Amino acid sequence: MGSMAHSDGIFKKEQAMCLEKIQRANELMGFNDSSPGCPGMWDNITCWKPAHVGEMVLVSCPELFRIFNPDQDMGVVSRNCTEDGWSEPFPHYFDACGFDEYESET
Amino acid sequence: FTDSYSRYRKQMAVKKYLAAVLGKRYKQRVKNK
């Protein structure tokens, strides 16, 4: 009752699988002192690669008409990345793309 | 630094897609929250 497993927000293995490669890109990076930014991040529906300063990444789900098998990168959410870090979701989240849904069509 | 491509994308993202995809598929879900 207090703690839920959240079967809806499980995003398959993509949660631990993507966050694992982002952790490697975190300490290894590739920006240095020229074009800084974020070291990577993982949200509630899509994977985010290390972005630069003032970058708005819009990542949509493969085939917006035939959303069946979810590989990676879903729900087009544009999150900016300034020098302070990551900004707020816009479009907002609240379950962006339907991948764990039943009959998503109609 | 893709602000040149995301410039016009802010027209069909938070404006259109917001209610389009987050309303067509979902109907009795939103159990994650």
Domain boundaries defined on chain A: 1-87
Whole-angstrom Cα distance, residue A82 to residue A103? 38
Nearest-CA residue of chain A relative to B33?
A94
Give CA separation, A28 vs A18, A21, A50, A53, A62, in Å.
15, 11, 11, 18, 29
Nearest by CB to A58, which of B9, B25, B31?
B9
Residues of chain B by 3-state class (helix, strand, coil), percent to 5? 50, 0, 50
Cβ proximity of A76 and A61 under 8 Å: yes
Q: Which residues from B are below 8 Å from A when comparing CB atoms?
A: 1-3, 6, 9-10, 13-14, 17-18, 21-22, 24-26, 29-33
Cα atoms found within 13 Å of the Cα of residue A74, Cβ hemisphere only:
26
Task: Report the structure determination method.
Answer: NMR
Give me the sign of the Cα torsion angle A48, A51, A56, A57: negative
CATH code at A1-87: 4.10.1240.10
Nearest CA in chain A to B31: A8
Place of tokens 């491509």: B5
